[PDB]
């Protein structure tokens, strides 16, 4: 699709069998989702947002559907205001910015 | 332009007579620029994301040139770690997400 930006670019994602909502986020390097159970091991990561740096759980090679497109990659789990799909997965679904 | 998302989508902006580098940010309602002086009235605002909230100054009816395109709207100014062009100005230059 072509998504205009008058409203938040919210899409449905599917991860661990659960449907969730997430923001398509060109301003994020990484994908960050609210606390949920994911399979496998995780590793530590510090990410820096508008308010400062926080600790999150980094899960690699996680299967996730984004607006109907399958991606498999890194998902960070931690205290974010809204679920965000960052560039690591936007590239997998072939997303570009256009004007 | 068509901007791929392998790297941060950074562009050159002109604001308050100054050139700055800024991130094109579909994940941000508002545009937020590192602290600087702007002309006219302002009022305080709190904005929150990863890491919590920061206090900013809200200036309305500010003209910015974004990668050669002039837009006008509200600009928030404060201690953001990165200059962010949010949806309020991205709409004005006709920016879309496409996949
Ligand atoms: C968290 C989003 C809901 C909102 N944010 C925009 C977001 O794109 C920021 C924009 C941003 C970008 C860089 C630094 C600080 C903030 N990116 C971000 O937090 O990304 C994190 C996840 O991937 C990492 O790569 C960048 C930082 C990490 S935000 O900066 O916090 C924000 C919040 C409120 C307003 N009004 C305007 C902006």
Which domain CATH number covers A57?
Answer: 2.40.70.10
Cβ-proximal residues to B76 (8 Å cutoff; 6+ apart), any chain? B30, B31, B32, B33, B45, B47, B56, B57, B58, B59
Q: Are B34 and B13 in contact (CB under 8 A)?
A: no
Tell me the chain A residues in contact with residue B5 when contact means C-beta distances shorter than 8 Å: 26, 87, 90-91, 95-97
Say how many Å lie between the CA of residue B25 and the centre of ligand 1.
Answer: 8
Provide the number of structural domains found in chain B. Answer: 1
Q: How was this structure determined?
A: X-ray
Q: Which residues lie across from B43 on neighbouring strands?
A: B58
Coil, helix or strand at residue A90: helix
How far does A57 lie from chain B, in Å, by closest CA? 14
Q: What is the rounded distance in angstroms from the CA atom of residue A32 to the CA atom of residue A25?
A: 10
Coil, helix or strand at residue B4: coil
Helices (DSSP H) in A3-96: which residue ranges?
87-90
Out of B47, B50, B57, mutate this one to test ligand 1's pocket (max ligand atoms within 8 Å of CB): namely B50
Cβ-proximal residues to A74 (8 Å cutoff; 6+ apart), any chain? A30, A31, A58, A59, A60, A61, A62, A88
The residue written with tokens 């969730």 in the block is A20
Tell me the chain B residues in contact with residue A67 when contact means C-beta distances shorter than 8 Å: 99
Q: What is the rounded distance in angstroms from the CA atom of residue A24 to the CA atom of residue B68?
A: 25
Q: What is the rounded distance in angstroms from the CA atom of residue B99 to the CA atom of residue B97?
A: 7
Closest residue of B to A69, CA-based? B99
Coil, helix or strand at residue B91: helix
Q: What is the rounded distance in angstroms from the CA atom of residue A64 to the CA atom of residue B68?
A: 37
Closest CA to A13 of A78, A99, A93: A93
Using alpha carbons only, give the angle A30, A33, A36 rounded to the nearest 5 degrees: 140
Q: Which residues lie across from B97 on neighbouring strands?
A: A3, A97
Q: Which domain holds residue A81?
A: 1-99
User: Cβ atoms within 10 A of the Cβ of A71, count?
Assistant: 20
Say how many Å lie between the CA of residue B18 and the centre of ligand 1.
Answer: 23
Determine the residue among A6, A27, A47, A78 to mutate to test chain B binding: the one whose Cβ has the most chain B Cβ atoms within 10 Å.
A27
Pull the structure tokens for residue A25.
Answer: 């986020």
Pull the structure tokens for residue A66.
Answer: 């984004």
User: Cβ atoms within 10 A of the Cβ of A68, count?
Assistant: 12
The residue written with tokens 């809204």 in the block is A82
Q: What is the rounded distance in angstroms from the CA atom of residue B29 to the CA atom of residue B88?
A: 6
**Strand B84-85 to strand B18-24: parallel, antiparallel, or no bridges (unpaired)?**
parallel
């Amino acid at each position: 699709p072509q998504i205009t930006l008058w409203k938040r670019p919210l899409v449905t994602i599917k991860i661990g069998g659960q449907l969730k909502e997430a923001l398509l986020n060109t301003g994020a390097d990484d994908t960050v989702i609210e606390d949920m159970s994911l399979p496998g091991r995780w590793k530590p990561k510090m990410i820096g947002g508008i308010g400062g740096f926080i600790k999150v759980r980094q899960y690699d090679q996680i299967i996730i559907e984004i607006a109907g497109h399958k991606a498999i990659g890194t998902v960070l789990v931690g205290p974010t205001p809204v679920n965000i799909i960052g560039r690591n997965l936007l590239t997998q679904i072939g997303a570009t910015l256009n004007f």
